[PDB]
Design a protein around this motif. Sequence first.
Motif, short mmCIF file in Angstrom:
data_model
loop_
_atom_site.label_atom_id
_atom_site.label_comp_id
_atom_site.label_asym_id
_atom_site.label_seq_id
_atom_site.Cartn_x
_atom_site.Cartn_y
_atom_site.Cartn_z
N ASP A 123 0.80 -1.29 0.11
CA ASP A 123 -0.11 -0.21 0.07
C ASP A 123 0.85 1.30 -0.16
O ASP A 123 0.53 2.12 -0.61
N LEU A 124 1.91 1.35 0.84
CA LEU A 124 2.80 2.33 1.01
C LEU A 124 3.80 2.59 -0.30
O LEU A 124 4.01 3.66 -0.59
N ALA A 134 2.77 2.27 -3.15
CA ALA A 134 1.95 2.77 -4.23
C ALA A 134 2.12 4.40 -4.42
O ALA A 134 1.83 5.21 -5.24
N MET A 135 2.75 4.90 -3.15
CA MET A 135 2.88 6.35 -3.02
C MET A 135 4.27 6.83 -2.86
O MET A 135 4.37 8.10 -2.83
#
Lengths: 11, 253, 249, 247
Positions: B150-151, B153-154
């Motif tokens: 998730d992290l 992705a950014m």
Amino acid sequence: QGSIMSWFAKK
Amino acid sequence: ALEARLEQASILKKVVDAIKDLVQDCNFDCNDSGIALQAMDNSHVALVSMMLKAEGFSPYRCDRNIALGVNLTSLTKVLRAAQNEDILTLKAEDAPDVLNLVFESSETDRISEYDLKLMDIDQEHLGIPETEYAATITMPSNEFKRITTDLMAMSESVTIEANGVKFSCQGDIGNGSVTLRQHTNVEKPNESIEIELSEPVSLTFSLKYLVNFCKASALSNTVKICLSNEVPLLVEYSLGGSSYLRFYLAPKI
Amino acid sequence: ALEARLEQASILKKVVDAIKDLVQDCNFDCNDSGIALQAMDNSHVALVSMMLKAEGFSPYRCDRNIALGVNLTSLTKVLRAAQNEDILTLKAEDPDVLNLVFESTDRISEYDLKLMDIDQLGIPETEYAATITMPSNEFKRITTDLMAMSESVTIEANKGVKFSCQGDIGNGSVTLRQHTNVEKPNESIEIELSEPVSLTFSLKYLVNFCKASALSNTVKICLSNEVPLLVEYSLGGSSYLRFYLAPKI
Amino acid sequence: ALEARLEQASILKKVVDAIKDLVQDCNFDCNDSGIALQAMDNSHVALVSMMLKAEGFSPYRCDRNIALGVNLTSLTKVLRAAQNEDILTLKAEDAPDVLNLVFESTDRISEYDLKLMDIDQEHEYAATITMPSNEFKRITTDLMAMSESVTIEANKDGVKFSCQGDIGNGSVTLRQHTNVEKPNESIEIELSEPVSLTFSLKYLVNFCKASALSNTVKICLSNEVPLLVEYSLGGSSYLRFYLAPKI
């Protein structure tokens, strides 16, 4: 970004 | 010289799949204790360290030290041919040219046999120091996969701070953090977060690599994360008993 | 002229999907016996032969020979609209279009598929030197896996049946031995052998044939020195989808 | 200025996922009524209209009207980090630069500050059809394999979806039916007048990306106006798609 070889020596 | 039988091929399939994007070529070092692997990734940032112990096989025989020089892309092509519940036997003679893999179907009368050509790989072995880490986190492995994915992705980088444990990142779209608190889950122990801390830690790592390490999430429902300041990350999965797959990652400096 | 009702449309969807990469255009020849299809691939290596027998329909009515000239990619677009548990009815008059009706609920889907004109392959009955009946997904798995290593497989049948290949990464073989599975008969390996055979085939084609594996839990593989390899799937009853592949020479 | 708490993050995750292929950039307009969105799709053909009502939150507080200018691809990256059963809280200041999102599980707190952008806000039916949303998805997807356009005809007794293409003609006819054993499978038509209109399938298929929001979809037709395709988000909250008929 360090290299792993800076922390772990040969052998 | 080597004859090592796995009741279920599953484990070896998952290990190689967990490793093959970090490591193209490597040696499987076989001895009486079992089958070990140590290799740096292509860019010399991460170290992969695996040990499948003799006791994990049934039976295991290694009469002599044997190095199996393997291309993992090649090995993957062969291992894909084994079903998870196949019986898998590794054989090799002294000073071998090929690795012999035999897959026996548990559902029908089918025997698969591959002679995988071995290559010559130059050792490049590193000593891993025995380390008392400043902090240890034992958490659900799927949780760690979810956080890193998730992290990533950014942001390309995650800061891990332990005092609970906070994963934070910054990127174009903004900021993100995931904080985990020490919690023992008595009814569903798999959900538990265990933190042993002697000293606060704050380190920054490449997410790319952590996400690769989490390909090993199918091996175990638990992952162990070990931190010390100015020291490489250890991400460890148990393969049962004292067998293991370990990932070491240098911090960004 | 034609009115043919299939209790489960699933089967025809799966057949066309299994065939459409080998054969783009073909005739569905309809007569009193049922609905047949015969075609050779663009490269003249493989032959497809299908027969859906009249008895498999309820009802089946065909007033004479009728050729339904179809593009299979086009037919796939229509067949995708049938659910597995739909009833399918084919109608055509003495024809420019094929009428397909898919019935659930009271839901009706109806398509008029434009036909084309395609110019109209009797395969003589052979007693093969060797037969293997095995689980169809097992055969898919073997062909797919060996194809990762090699473009060719040698198939030997003797005192089991051995699929072998060689490539850059090394050598690989899969041996199947005669075995009756009493508790799970579909898992059985049945081998009839009258004569040893050893022949080499393109894996690409065999892997294409295994697109049909969802049709049946068993596949039949027939080998002869004189004639092409036969890979056969049951379409229910004595209906069938057959693939023929010439050996590499 | 804004503080809006969702008991379950599920709904917002599904809405954004249902919208992000139609709409890249948009404003989430927040006011006393709740959180609304009105935007043309990327190609400026269809209109997306969403309302998450204040009553759907617990609590909801908006002290003044706020536009949250968001890239939905960016928001999706953040929302993917919320589990369906997470407690989700939105916060923002007056005239905000970032949106603050907090996901609470386990003993996990996730917190994101999403950078906002400046986005310009572009400035009674003859028949209603209530049917299973997955049925509508299935029909539109299947017909789209052979045609760019679908005609929808409705009367007392049923709805017919028909289309034409090079490969031929196809239709799916559904009869008015209350399904006693499987009520969600029921087809309801409320009709004041029969209607027959033609639409682009590509857009209808996109609208059906919203099908996981609800087991039913509402399709509203008139000759005078655009098609309405409506999914309920619970209570009187909704996600609506508007599409003009082909001329």
